Amino acid sequence: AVGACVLCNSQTSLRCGACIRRPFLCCKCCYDHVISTSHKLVLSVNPYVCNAPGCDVTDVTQLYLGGMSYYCKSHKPPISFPLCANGQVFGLYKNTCVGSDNVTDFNAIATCDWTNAGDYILANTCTERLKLFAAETLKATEETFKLSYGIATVREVLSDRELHLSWEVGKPRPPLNRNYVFTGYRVTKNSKVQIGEYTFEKGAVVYRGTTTYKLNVGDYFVLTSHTVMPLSAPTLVPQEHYVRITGLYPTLNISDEFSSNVANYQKVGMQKYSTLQGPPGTGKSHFAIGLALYYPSARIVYTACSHAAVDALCEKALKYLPIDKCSRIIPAVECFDKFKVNSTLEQYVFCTVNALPETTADIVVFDEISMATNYDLSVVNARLRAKHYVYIGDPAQLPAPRTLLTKGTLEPEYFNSVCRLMKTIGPDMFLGTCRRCPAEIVDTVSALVYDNKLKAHKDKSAQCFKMFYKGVITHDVSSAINRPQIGVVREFLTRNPAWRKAVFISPYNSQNAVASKILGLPTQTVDSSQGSEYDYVIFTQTTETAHSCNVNRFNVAITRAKVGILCIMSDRDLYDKLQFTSLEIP
Amino acid sequence: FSSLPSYAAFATAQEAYEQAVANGDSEVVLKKLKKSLNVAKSEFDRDAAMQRKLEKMADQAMTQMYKQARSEDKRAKVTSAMQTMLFTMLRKLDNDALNNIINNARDGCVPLNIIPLTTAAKLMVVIPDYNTYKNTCDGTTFTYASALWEIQQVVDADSKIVQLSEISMDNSPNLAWPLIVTALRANSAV
Amino acid sequence: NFNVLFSTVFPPTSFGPLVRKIFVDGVPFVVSTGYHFRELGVVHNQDVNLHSSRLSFKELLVYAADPAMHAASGNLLLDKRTTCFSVAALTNNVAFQTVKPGNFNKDFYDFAVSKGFFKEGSSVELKHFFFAQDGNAAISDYDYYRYNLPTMCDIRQLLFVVEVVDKYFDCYDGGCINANQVIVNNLDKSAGFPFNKWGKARLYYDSMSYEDQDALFAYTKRNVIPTITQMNLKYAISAKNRARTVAGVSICSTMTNRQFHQKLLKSIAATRGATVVIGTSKFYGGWHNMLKTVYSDVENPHLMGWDYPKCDRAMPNMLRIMASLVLARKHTTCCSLSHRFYRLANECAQVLSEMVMCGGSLYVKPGGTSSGDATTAYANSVFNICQAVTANVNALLSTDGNKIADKYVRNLQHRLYECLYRNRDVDTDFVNEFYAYLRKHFSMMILSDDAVVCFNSTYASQGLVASIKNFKSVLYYQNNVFMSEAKCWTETDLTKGPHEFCSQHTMLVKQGDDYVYLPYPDPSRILGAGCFVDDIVKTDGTLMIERFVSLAIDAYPLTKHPNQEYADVFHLYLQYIRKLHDELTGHMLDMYSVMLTNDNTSRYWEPEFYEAMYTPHTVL
RNA sequence: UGACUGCUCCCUAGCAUGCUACUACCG
RNA sequence: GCGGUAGUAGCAUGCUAGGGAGCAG
Ligand SMILES: [Zn+2]
Ligand SMILES: [Zn+2]
Ligand SMILES: [Zn+2]
Ligand SMILES: [Zn+2]
């Protein structure tokens, strides 16, 4: 009930009641926020509401203080005193305030119902605590929106890859894939019982989960909305290039995992943070593995953003680093348990930001910056307080599932504070070495966003195919379908024998489900499917609208396949920019 | 107390009236002076009293709310302390012998007086004199409560180590006699 | 009554709390969910939940006061110093606690000696000191519970004595009160174990709001909460060299016992002219009024007083149950029949037979009263009245009825036998008749096991009214103690009051125009309080002059005593007060330059300020 | 390490009531 | 000419709250 206000940092006792997160407001700030905005409720050690029996007023500018309680105009005693006066609300530490002038932007942040692009513009354009508050309230409103959904009434199950499941009345079908996790809890007689961490395929219900339970009666599948804890640390800590390498020990020998990893260490050893600006399959994986043994006496942390993207997080660590030096952190969902759980002392911890064993370090690595918000940066900076760290990830990737915005797409400058921090002043690191890839992605993404700092390592045989087909779009439900995909898969496998074992990018997951039901291709997620790409992939049409195709969803999709990248021109794409081979359908 | 809303009017009227008095005018101006100043002071009176009442009311309200906040902080810290104590004392329950004797009960309920008697790992004995000592814990291992215990340490009333070689009949009057013997369960728990 | 007899066969390790395992967020606990009494049988809790989420504040308070976890997370203990049952040791060391001597006020002693005091052969000498104790004193004093034995009662006679006692307790009102009507004084005292590790009673009375207290109080009408009692040693002046010990009850018991009993307790301590004289003061003519009330209109008056050897260590359990039931009879509208039984069970489990924490170990209390609960003195008064009533009944029923000259008393004895052994239900008319007979021929004044009785003498000689021998026999066969008649007195002259009541003697002096009764203490007690203090800062009189003012207030009536040193005590105190004041003023004017005034300060060394405290006019 | 009640004295702060006094308004 | 009302000062009375001390069971 006592703390610092979000603007003056002065001691206060007043909580605003019309903001969903109940921030701590300074008395002058409270007056400014209650006058210039329809936020007319204030909370103190006791609520600022009329206590007259039978009365109901919840204003602040309307109440009068009398005796010991608070009263209104209709019940003010002869000894009365208005609470809202002198442009300053009545509360503790009223004489030790300083006020602030950043009230209009704070009002806009509070009043912004998160509708248009300017919402995120001003979310990313403010002072530190306002960034924290905006991120917190954005996650709060999105989780309230997703919890405003029904309960999956289930009473029986057909079999594996089949399910009958019913939502509530007046509630629509929730979003489809693992980006919106389905984790429910049924009841037997008196309490809740376990169901399983799952996700649904289509509407036939195949299971893309990782378990199988005796599912039938009284089953409650829900997208579990979690209470959000308040933030402590800022989104980033301002760096300063050291002169002493404190704690860091360049070994006598050279652990030559990679050649340029020496320079890696050379400039990541002095600044309080760094970032691994990695194009797909371009050293985005094991530079930290080399750092593991070149700096073996340094406490090194590894993390990502989702439990799905732990492939390179967990493989080479056990593959080449010593067995004992690794450590595992997993809540107990289904993920790689290759290292040791329940071990506090170790130098190489591998996990996600979901849950860690609270400790501090001096070296951290952090993956998947593209779908990372300032909330995740703040929580990783709070849980881990290190000396240097790297944010693995590239702007030429996919945004976080910000379904909140509908009008304007969220561009690289609006991913998070760090993702534009390396955009304005330049990246901490810039690689130009593709591990295993022909120069198609080189040409494409170097003309688009890589600025041609990486060039042809593998030859361009021009086996990849792009055609003149356009496609037709039709909406049914929150997922759509494509007749010039139900026919187009067959029309494109007519005689070409090379893309029969390709992977299916899924702008619409229901369309991929129908393709699997009819012809059959593996389902490939869009956002959380980096590093899971095979050697051979089809980029399908699947859409023409502003769902996916402005710039930054295909920058990684062009790199899914290595030699045979069938990226047909679907819609208002970057057609007249390069050279691409084509075959005309009969 | 000097910039009240009625202060300007009262002071200006007083100054004008006293200037008129210093002008040496007739008695009518003096009567008007007296009436105006009397009513001016009368109206200043309540404006000087009600404000002083209100300030003290506000100060009392502030003090009460401050003490309420302090009480809430103290409650939070005592709750944290109690939770910590409970979760700390939880970690010594020996959850295999306790489970073994709980499951034998016909409904899950057992007397509290037989839990330390059958699941404890350490035993402490307080001995008044040597005659009682030689009948209870003579030697290095003794039997009590249908179990076998072996001695681990012996101290005296001053908490100083005592070796069993000097607990004899002749040397008895040279010890702080409220001796405390510590033993471990043999073959069972510690 | 039958359970008391039958419980002596079964093993003693099957009595007490019954525990089981519950789960809170997947972790296992051990909590008490019932009790097994020697008298009340098996009792099970009504609201117990095995699986639950994170617990609240009152659940934490309840689980932190249960001895189950403390006993289950401790070492076994076999103690051969005492013969009482032992449970567990909470630490790895045994704590030995000593008692320190007093502090000597040399200036007062020299001043008293320089005025002809403490000469050889004098009738006033010091016999009140601070006695010191060695390490093994607390356990030696706790070992006195071996005098408590299981006692079966004559039920057909107790069921009539209880009716007469209830007739005695009839002019009051009581019931339950809300948490906002509870009056507590001195909230800066201990809260018991284990609550004394975090604060005093203020912390727990502030951290708990009103509906939390109400919910906690309503929780004990369907469940039983066993607690732990801590034993402490006293540091006070006395005349004998044995250690004294009081019991510190837990806060969770006192907090609810107050809400249960405070209305009746406050109603008792506000009535004047009743049998129980708790609340009446002795100043402003109170002593004379009490003495005149107790004399009533008895026909051949004598006075008598008796004594209880080991009153609290030897009182049987059945009489404590009876006292609790008598006190709890005012709840006929606010409480149901199960609520009253559960309140009785909670009281028995908390202050009659529970785990005590002596030194650093847990023991089992066999029985008796734990002096220090919320209802000590009133229960003692009920017990005293019960013993007096049964002594009168035994005196009347054991007389040859063929030699009783009066026929009314013969019919009364016949009806008494019929109502005791030939009637199954209550007969209110005879209860009223016996109560009137007792109040006419046997007058009492009771203050928590201290009593003065004015009785008809010829009736007692003929055997129609209880005597000292009847009290001796009743105590022998119902209290398991022997009452020597060397600690009892008898006074056949009413112009001199009781020989001793509440450690005060009585004298009949002439003040104003009439004659009144005044109390005076033992001079040795006053002088010992003057010369021996606890604290070092009380060996400098100028720092506390208000101690001697109170001590001289207590010692005023000694100036009317025919003996001469007794008045010299009061005069010496007045002269010492004047000397201390002069010392302060001069001693402060000298080094500093502050000048003191003697305005309305000389009242403290003149007798008129003290004479007004014993004259009936009631000031402040 | 300091239990539950009862009574009494001293000091300060607030509230209510009453007595007197000094100005002012009204009839 | 008498009364009413509004402040101000001194004095007395009883409660509530805080602190220091004494006795009794
Ligand atoms: Zn607001
Ligand atoms: Zn502020
Ligand atoms: Zn109102
Ligand atoms: Zn009741």
Swiss-Prot record, chain A:
Domain (+)RNA virus helicase ATP-binding: 253-431
Reactions catalysed, as given in the entry: ATP + H2O = ADP + phosphate + H(+)
Recorded consequence of changing residue 334 to D: In strain: Gamma/P.1
Domain CV ZBD: 1-113
Residues that hold a ribonucleoside 5'-triphosphate according to the record: 278-285
Subcellular localization(s) per the UniProt record: Host endoplasmic reticulum-Golgi intermediate compartment
Superkingdom assignment: Viruses
Domain spans labelled (+)RNA virus helicase C-terminal: 432-586
Binding, Zn(2+) 12: 16, 19, 33, 39
Positions bound to Zn(2+) 11: 5, 8, 26, 29
Binding site for Zn(2+) 13: 50, 55, 72, 75
LRR repeat intervals: 224-244
Stated consequence of mutating residue 412 to S: In strain: Mu/B.1.621
Signal sequence bounds: none
Documented effect of changing residue 361 to V: In strain: Theta/P.3
Functional description taken from the UniProt entry: Plays a role in viral RNA synthesis. Multi-functional protein with a zinc-binding domain in N-terminus displaying RNA and DNA duplex-unwinding activities with 5' to 3' polarity. Activity of helicase is dependent on magnesium. Binds to host TBK1 and inhibits TBK1 phosphorylation; the interaction with TBK1 decreases IRF3 phosphorylation, which leads to reduced IFN-beta production.
Assembly with partners or alone: Interacts with nsp8 to form the replication-transcription complex (RTC): nsp12, nsp7, two subunits of nsp8, and up to two subunits of nsp13. Interacts with host TBK1; this interaction inhibits TBK1 phosphorylation and decreases by 75% IRF3 phosphorylation, which leads to reduced IFN-beta production.
Protein's recorded name: Helicase nsp13
Native source species: Severe acute respiratory syndrome coronavirus 2
Gene: rep
Residues of the full protein shown: 5325 to 5917 of 7096
Swiss-Prot record, chain C:
Region of interest (RdRp Fingers N-ter), ranges: 56-270
Residue intervals of the RdRp catalytic domain: 301-463
Region (RdRp Palm C-ter) location: 369-504
Active site positions: 448-450
Annotated catalysed reactions: RNA(n) + a ribonucleoside 5'-triphosphate = RNA(n+1) + diphosphate; a 5'-end diphospho-ribonucleoside in mRNA + GTP + H(+) = a 5'-end (5'-triphosphoguanosine)-ribonucleoside in mRNA + diphosphate
Effect seen on changing residue 12 to L: In strain: Alpha/B.1.1.7, Beta/B.1.351, Gamma/P.1, Delta/B.1.617.2 Iota/B.1.526, Kappa/B.1.617.1, Lambda/C.7, Epsilon/B.1.427/B.1.429, Theta/P.3, Zeta/P.2, Mu/B.1.621, Omicron/BA.1, Omicron/BA.2, Omicron/BA.2.12.1, Omicron/BA.2.75, Omicron/BA.4, Omicron/BA.5, Omicron/BQ.1.1, Omicron/XBB.1.5, Omicron/EG.5.1
Residues reported to bind Zn(2+) 10: 176, 331, 334-335
Required cofactor(s): Mg(2+)
Domain Nsp12 RNA-dependent RNA polymerase residues, every copy: 54-620
Source organism, top-level taxon: Viruses
Activation/inhibition comment: Inhibited by Remdesivir antiviral drug (GS-5734) through non-obligate RNA chain termination.
Region (RdRp Palm N-ter), start-end ranges: 271-309
Region Interaction with RMP Remdesivir: start-end pairs: 234-244
Region named RdRp Fingers C-ter: 310-368
Residue numbers spanned by region RdRp Thumb: 505-620
Function: RNA-directed RNA polymerase that catalyzes the transcription of viral genomic and subgenomic RNAs. Acts in complex with nsp7 and nsp8 to transcribe both the minus and positive strands of genomic RNA. The kinase-like NiRAN domain of NSP12 attaches one or more nucleotides to the amino terminus of NSP9, forming a covalent RNA-protein intermediate that serves as transcription/replication primer.
Assembly mode: Interacts with nsp7 and nsp8 to form the replication-transcription complex (RTC): nsp12, nsp7, two subunits of nsp8, and up to two subunits of nsp13. Interacts with nsp9.
UniProt name for this protein: RNA-directed RNA polymerase nsp12
Source organism (scientific name): Severe acute respiratory syndrome coronavirus 2
